[PDB]
Each structure stands twice: as C-alpha cells, then as structure tokens.
Amino acid sequence: SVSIDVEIKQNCLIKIINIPQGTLKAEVVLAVRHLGYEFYCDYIDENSNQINSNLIQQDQHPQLNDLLKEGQAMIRFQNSDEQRLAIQKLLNHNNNKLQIEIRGQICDVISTIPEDEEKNYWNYIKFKKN
C-alpha cells in the first residue's frame, strides 16, 4: 500500500551469453522484449578482465578470448513482478536452462542476478551513464 521508504527491483535483471556476430544489443533486446514486456536492456562485455598468453589452453590455463569485446547482454525491467511474468512464460512445462534465439542466432539467457550483480550492474549503468 504505502511505504515511508523506497525499494528497488530484484528479479528485473538478467544476463545472457552467446553473442551473435555483429548483432548488437538491439536484437538482444528485441528478442527478449517481444516476449511480454518493454524493459531497458544494455549489452556489455566482461569488465576489467586480465589477459591470456598467446593462443594456447593448458589444463588450468586462461583462454585466448580473455579480454574479448561484445559477448553477453544485460536486460533490466521496470518491475520485478513483470520480469517474473516474462520469466514464468519462458519457463515452459519444465524448468531447465532458459534458451533464446536472437537475431536468428541461438543465445543463452539467465533470469538470475544476485545482489552482487544487481548492485554491480545497476551502479555500473548508473556510473557509465548516471
């Protein structure tokens, strides 16, 4: 009803991988949104990533595409309940890992963003944009 305080959204955040060649965040957004909502989505590559050694991958050795550009997209809804709604849809008959094809390409989508990530992304965008 009414709260003297204010609270942000939790479920309204998610992460997706399998970045399609060239395909920008627009196609990632268009694919996700077409579902059931209009939620602000932004794509971002790994943050301050380290570096790898040439192109070789031992047993516990880093991979070549360490500090690669464009790899996953972030999506934010104006409501947690909504985000959920969009979730319950993709859910389907059984749980399993959500999957979506964006811009005619198959990309992996995860509807779970922990506090660490919520705060990171929120503040991130609020830091890059503000």
Curated annotation (Swiss-Prot):
Disrupted-gene phenotype: Critically short telomeres. Reduced accumulation of telomerase RNA TER.
UniProt feature coiled coil, ranges: none
Taxonomy, superkingdom: Eukaryota
Annotated GO biological process: telomerase catalytic core complex assembly; telomerase RNA stabilization; telomere maintenance via telomerase
One Gene Ontology MF term: telomerase RNA binding
Entry keywords, A to Z: Chromosome, RNA-binding, Telomere
xRRM domain residues: 7-130
Effect of residue 40 to A: Decreased binding to TER RNA stem-loop IV
GO cellular component terms attached to this protein's record: chromosome, telomeric region; telomerase holoenzyme complex
Record's subcellular location: Chromosome, Telomere
Assembly, per entry: Component of the telomerase holoenzyme complex, composed of the catalytic core (the catalytic subunit TERT, the telomerase RNA template component TER and TAP65/p65), which is associated with two heterotrimeric subcomplexes: (i) the replication protein A (RPA)-related subcomplex, composed of TEB1, RPA2/TEB2 and RPA3/TEB3 and (ii) the CST-like subcomplex, composed of TAP75/p75, TAP45/p45 and TAP19/p19. TEB1 and the CST-like subcomplex are tethered to the catalytic core by TAP50/p50.
Protein family membership: Belongs to the LARP7 family.
Comment, domains: The HTH La-type RNA-binding and RRM domains cooperatively bind to TER RNA UUU-3'OH sequence after it is transcribed by Polymerase III. UUU-3'OH-binding by the HTH La-type RNA-binding and RRM domains positions the xRRM domain to bind to the adjacent proximal stem-loop IV and central dinucleotide GA bulge.
Biological role: RNA-binding protein required for assembly of the holoenzyme telomerase ribonucleoprotein (RNP) complex. Telomerase is an essential ribonucleoprotein enzyme that copies new telomeric repeats onto chromosome ends by repetitively synthesizing the short telomere-repeat sequence 5'-TTGGGG-3' using an RNA template component TER.
This protein's name: La-related protein 7 homolog
Native source species: Tetrahymena thermophila (strain SB210)
Residue range from the parent sequence: 369 to 519 of 542
